[PDB]
Each structure stands twice: as C-alpha cells, then as structure tokens.
Design a protein. Sequence first.
Length: 125
Amino acid sequence: MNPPPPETSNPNKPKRQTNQLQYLLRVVLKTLWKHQFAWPFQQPVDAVKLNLPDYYKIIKTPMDMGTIKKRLENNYYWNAQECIQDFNTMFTNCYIYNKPGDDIVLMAEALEKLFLQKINELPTE
Ligand SMILES: CCNc1ncnc2cc(OC)c(OC)cc12
C-alpha cells in the first residue's frame, strides 16, 4: 500500500530562486534524467504496481527525481543544498532498501557518481 508522495509545494515554506538551483534543474537533473539508468528513479516507488509491499515499511523518507524535478520547477527550495539533500536521500534509500550487487544498486552507484561530478562545481550567486 502506498503513502502519499512527497510534497512539491508548500505555501508557508519560503521560496528562493538562485543560480545554483537553476543549474541543478537545467544541468544536473536534466542530464541525470536522460541516463540509461535513470528510469527506476524518475517517479515515486509504487509498492502496489512494483509488488514491493516491504518498501515503505523500510523506507521512511521517500524521494525520487520526479519529485525533485517538480520541486525545482515549482521553486520549492530555498537553496541548492536542500535540493542536493533530496538527491542524497534518493540514493541512500536505494542502498538501504536493497543490497550491494543488486542491479538497481549498480544503477544508483553510476548515477551517484555522475551526480557528484556535476555538483562538484556550481555557478556563483
Ligand atoms: C520503475 C520500476 N522501478 C523499480 N523496479 C524494480 N525494483 C525497484 C527497486 C527500487 O528500490 C531502490 C526502486 O526505487 C528506485 C525502483 C524499482
């Protein structure tokens, strides 16, 4: 059974548009998105569809690139670090729910390395 997906808007949360957040969407997210390993990460896990009834019993802070993309597009974040934390949560969830060697973990490992390459240098404010 599925929990609500993470929020992509929150009227009482302060918004900010920064060069670094613009970069995270235009370059970081949209480059990862096109990777051949991106597809398991482009939407919230559907435990009913994917037959993973154990997923949300294990993962308590769900995150995915679909959610991140919407947050960036909706100006949800205050700064780039907040968005980077969502990416780190997404990767960490994968490692927690699975185990070393799994096909999905090999995918997360490759995307995480590409992610780090991209955020190594960010634009200035
Ligand atoms: C769209 C299909 N996605 C998936 N299919 C099979 N197993 C998955 C396992 C996962 O846990 C890390 C997962 O979330 C990243 C997506 C999975």
